[PDB]
Every structure is written in C-alpha cells, then in structure tokens.
Design a binder for this molecule. Structure first.
Ligand SMILES: OC[C@@]1(O)OC[C@@H](O)[C@@H](O)[C@@H]1O
Ligand SMILES: OC[C@@]1(O)OC[C@@H](O)[C@@H](O)[C@@H]1O
Length: 90
C-alpha cells in the first residue's frame, strides 16, 4: 500500500539520505546540496530505519531493514554497503 521511509542527514549543507521501502525493496535517494540522485543502497525489506554519525569528515550510516521478524543491518563506512553484526534478541 503506502511506502515507508526513513531519513538521516549530516553536516550543514547538508547531506540527506532518504530510504524508501516499496513492495519489499528498499532504495535510497541522496542530496548533498546540488540535486537529488539515486544512491547505491538496494536491499530487501518492508520496513526501514536509519541512523548515522560523523567521525571527523567521514560519514557512517547504519540502515535496519526488516522482513517478517528478521532485521538486517547494512553499513556504509565509505566503501560500499556491507552487512553488519546486528542481531535481534530472544
Ligand atoms: O555519494 C553517494 C553515496 O555514495 O553516499 C553514501 C551512501 O549514501 C551511498 O549509498 C551513496 O551512493
Ligand atoms: O563496522 C561495522 C560495525 O561493527 O559497525 C558498528 C555496528 O553497526 C556493528 O553492528 C557493525 O558490524
């Protein structure tokens, strides 16, 4: 039905990342001050949340993608999206 989004931002320009879960696929749109464009993130999920932090000038992003009761963490640390160590509790 209705897509579900999550958003994060950093800096002062700023940079913004908006993740949209649509029909089981999460994609990413990006802003760094000069126009929206499509990001590299593509992962399965019906629900999405996100957080990010800076270490100096380097952004680190964590996206939590959920299907059913399984949540997978995806990490951006400058070098492509890698699977994180996040696991659920009992
Ligand atoms: O410069 C765009 C980009 O590299 O920014 C960091 C992450 O949002 C990536 O998915 C995205 O493609
Ligand atoms: O560098 C990746 C990592 O260690 O970053 C911190 C947390 O997001 C962890 O789950 C994740 O595996």
């Amino acid at each position: 039905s209705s897509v579900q989004t999550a958003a994060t931002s950093w800096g002062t320009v700023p940079s913004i990342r908006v993740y949209t879960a649509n029909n089981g696929k999460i994609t990413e749109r990006c802003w760094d001050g000069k126009g929206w464009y499509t990001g590299a993130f593509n992962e399965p999920g019906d629900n999405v949340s996100v957080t990010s932090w800076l270490v100096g000038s380097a952004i680190h992003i964590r996206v939590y993608a959920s299907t059913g009761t399984t949540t997978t963490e995806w990490c951006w640390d400058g070098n492509g999206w890698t699977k994180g160590a996040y696991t659920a509790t009992n």
